[PDB]
């Protein structure tokens, strides 16, 4: 389960991670205290993982997002590229996906020129082939539904 | 114009976005008014887009995530397409992008069942042909990595 | 559930459909009465839908196979096209994908130029796109695993 | 060599794989050791070749199908893979295709988590790249159609 | 029905087409007007389709050769193409074709400014888009072989 | 040049490589020893290169055509494929070409299976990757345009 | 012809467009009334057609280059494209092609932003689809060849 | 840095890159050594990289041109490929691009005997698969843009 006053705590934390413990418990309709616990209930099982403003990438210099799809090079190998480029701190998300390519990252820079680097880096550094498509506009992102 | 000060507020509040202005204050050896004022602007221009809880899609039953790249059926008509799915809510997010395709969304959905009644929604109400690439794991996502 | 001797069962009848009332009783470790239960358990829930002989389609006369894949042309119509091909006897089986295309059948044939015929009997009858890939080859069929 | 008596064994035996001689007999006009006799060079030709109970694959615990195309990373070895695949259980078809692959794999997987990880034993055993298409409903299957 | 016979006096047509039936006779132990028999039963079964002089496109000022794959912009209607093509001189070869186009045309043009000409007469009288491959050089071509 | 007495010849000659010494100086305007003439120049400058009667590959046996395009892997090796294939009777002809893959053959094959063959064939004598297009449907083939 | 002197010439100035008449002159073996003779006949015939200096494009604010490529949706209506996006100041060159689409256009523009907005305006001012590559790096430009 | 005089220059500079000092200096009110000084700046710094010669590539022999895309065969060596192919003169230009591909290369030769054994030389001196488009009409190009 999730009862679904846990439902209505979820979606109202996703809309706006800055809602009160206080302004909460009116929407819901519940007490300061009954909230508080529900929503730490909630972080202890997995569910909120985590409390993020939305920064947006270009104001603080990021003029290039891009999807890089990866494939390794050598299946003898160990298929650990995510393990491998986790320090590499440009690559915001990293998933595993059924396709033609086995992993896809969404990797933001400076400009078309760092991104030529920084495939170049990802590419000796975990042992992949690499094929980016440019992001040319957000219209909007994070919108979690919660049904 | 992102000075210094700026600069960690933004990192902090990728960090944590519930992170109370008293905690920031010291952070940033400013008084809790100069905090809360240096947010504001955050805000107002473009840089702080909003405050989420980050909740796992899973724990709320969306077992399936897919990318689904799209390209209009007649793309001489200005182009309509993240406006009209704004209002379908298993998107997540919309890109534009370079290449072939026009946009790729993010999707998530209950089950492969639901995943086909989704594209059909998407291919009828944008007028597009869509490729879907079925996400199998996250490994990491929203590392947001202010420089 | 599907309690591990109805496994042995299934396992046994996939191998094997002809396989009788009494020399699965032994392999199973039952009676020619306890065994026949099971089976009819089995067959109603549904979990063995029916039992076939498995034709060599070349001797039959289908020298051409072909996976075929289908992308109705107007998304304002109804997605029917498994419905509307249903009636097609060439076609054996009809998939609903996550890819580029939205079905994919597979469809056996006399020659290359049965298949050239099919391919617009398929198009007009639904009203789809068609993508043909031809077999050259089947090294095994309908391996059914019993985890 | 199918005469019109051959036609309608392997007909029958489509359509009821446990059809017993008796009423195969009586459906072709001929004695039950005429076809036992019959049936059993349909069996030592290439005509049917072998009997299997049709299993639901969800029934047994495999929730994700897909297919794989597959291709060698060295093509100009003489081709192992069917062979080398042939040990992996969870692959059940495997035909070679003309076009840009080499074959086509149906497989059945409990989960996401573990198509990935047969996506790498495929990728390792037979030293191929993959493309993986998620089936999402199996409309009807198996129609096998005798002419 | 081709026996030995008509096997010999195809592969000697095939070598030369202008061979004199005084040469196909002696050549096949028959009389001048068993082999003028057998050639037009040839002729008017499907066997011997015509009779060609092999001309040197180039000497006749066909500089530029190319491949081009065509596919309908509205592939519902039935399709029209080689027969709406043939009127089209620089055309010298239409065939169907498996996979994502539907016909293949060899072409030849005095010019690469011929060709893109060309290539606008066929997306109209088609109404068709277009794949063209340069042909560099011919290093054999008709080779036709008689087993 | 290519005085048009001579075009009026080679288009005669394209058409029916059977035409008359006799019947062709009528349509041309000439004598019986004028069109000799002309014909033996035409066949030494390299202008007409053979006759040939054009046969039916179905009648004889040929039921797949396929083009197949090639690349050869290893660019430190001299590339010669057309020589290394040319002793492969299933292979009628080889061009050069601009495009994704250096060759183009055309080739003709008693069957699907036959194909399969040819091109591990291919692909260890000539030292390439294959990708294949089946032919459905000859609709002409030929017809040589003579400006 | 173009007599090698003339040829001297124009490598010079392909190498050097503010190379002297004098200058010029020594290297080429001739009279500063010589050469000056034979530049301007070069310019006359359609030989030099201009002299330019070479701008990079990143320190004027070209942040974004990209190829285009663009096919007519109409085969119906003239193709006219060329002249079409001529009054475009931000592509910079217009190539028709051979391959998968119609033209190539070399485009510059100040962001990733501004190139969604070329592309609408491409797309409704020709009437066309468009596909971009982006270029990340210039790595060596117009270094003309003289054989 | 570009104030409203450098971008006055290097307009005329890029319309006409023999411009004398003197029309210069009476274009940008300013004195023929301020200029002088002006256009030397702008040649140490980024932005005037030379000046040439815009050559007829027709009128000196080469009346083919292609884009030659190409991808290395092995990725994870740090790729060397302009450098490698600086050397060969009829590369006129090489961009590194994102997408599918690695570079683009504008390459231009006196005929199609002699692209195929450039592509042979491409191949083998860079290690890479190469997709030539071959140019049938340059319409404009160079048109240089300072905005």
Redesign the interface.
């Known amino acids: 389960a999730?009862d679904d006053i846990d439902?209505i705590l979820?979606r109202e934390?996703?809309?706006?991670?800055?809602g009160t413990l206080s302004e909460l418990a009116t929407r819901a309709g519940l007490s300061v205290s009954a909230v508080q616990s529900r929503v730490r209930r909630l972080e202890s099982?997995?569910?909120?993982?985590?409390?993020?403003?939305?920064?947006?990438?270009?104001?603080?210099?990021?003029?290039?997002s891009?999807?890089v799809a990866i494939?390794?090079?050598d299946?003898?190998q160990p298929?650990d590229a995510?393990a491998r480029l986790?320090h590499i701190?440009?690559?915001?998300?990293?998933?595993?996906?059924?396709?033609?390519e086995?992993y896809?990252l969404l990797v933001?820079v400076?400009?078309?020129?760092a991104?030529?680097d920084l495939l170049?880096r990802i590419?000796?550094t975990a042992?992949?082939?690499?094929?980016?498509?440019?992001?040319?506009?957000?219209?909007?992102?994070?919108?979690?539904?919660?049904?």
């Not at 934390?13 to 800055?18: F, K, Q, V, W």
């Not at 099982?45 to 290039?64: C, F, M, T």
């Not at 701190?89 to 595993?96: A, L, N, R």
Request: net charge neutral; hydrophobic share 35%.
């Open positions: 999730l439902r979820v934390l996703a809309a706006d991670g800055r099982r997995g569910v909120v993982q985590g409390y993020s403003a939305r920064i947006n990438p270009e104001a603080v210099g990021h003029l290039l891009a999807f494939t390794p090079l299946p003898s298929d995510p986790e701190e440009e690559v915001e998300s990293c998933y595993s996906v059924a396709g033609e086995s896809v933001r400076a400009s078309a020129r991104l030529e170049q590419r000796t042992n992949v082939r690499t094929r980016s498509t440019i992001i040319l506009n957000t219209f909007y992102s994070d919108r979690q539904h919660i049904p």
